[PDB]
Nucleic acid binder design. Structure first.
Length: 88
RNA sequence: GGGGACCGUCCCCCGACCGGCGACCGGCCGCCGCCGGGCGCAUUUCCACCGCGGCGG
C-alpha cells in the first residue's frame, strides 16, 4: 500500500485535480458452510447425521417491527473524533 | 265449432364432431406433504437450568 498521495487542503477537497491524479498515480500504464456431517456412533443407523447450524427458531412472536432505513453516518461513540479546547 | 299439417320454441332418446375435465365427480398409476404405528437408543434430536456469556430487536 501507499499513502493517500492527495494532500488535503480543505476537508473533502484534494489539492490535485482529477486529471493530475491520473498522471501521478500512473494509471496510463496500470490499466486492466451451513451443514457439517459427523458420525452417530451406533450400528444400523448409518453414521450420516447431517447437522446444520443456525437452526430455525422454535417460536415466532405474534408481531414484529420493520427494520429502519440506512443513515450513512451516526458513528458509535467509540469512533467519534475527540475535540479538545485550544486553551487546554 | 273439431282433427290434422306447418312454423317457433323447449323436453327427450339416439348417434357422430370439436373443445375442456372447468372453480360438477369418482378409479388408476406418478410426484409431493402430513399423520399413526414399527425399526432406528445416541458426535442425532428434544426438554429444563446455569453463565455479573456474544449477536439482532
Amino acid at each position: 500500500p501507499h499513502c493517500s498521495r492527495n494532500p488535503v487542503l480543505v476537508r473533502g477537497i484534494g489539492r490535485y485535480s482529477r486529471s493530475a491524479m491520473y498522471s501521478r498515480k500512473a494509471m496510463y500504464k496500470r490499466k486492466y458452510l451451513a451443514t457439517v456431517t459427523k458420525p452417530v456412533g451406533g450400528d444400523k443407523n448409518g453414521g450420516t447425521r447431517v447437522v446444520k447450524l443456525r437452526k430455525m427458531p422454535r417460536y415466532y412472536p405474534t408481531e414484529d417491527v420493520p427494520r429502519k432505513l440506512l443513515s450513512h453516518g451516526k458513528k458509535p461513540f467509540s469512533q467519534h473524533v475527540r475535540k479538545l479546547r485550544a486553551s487546554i
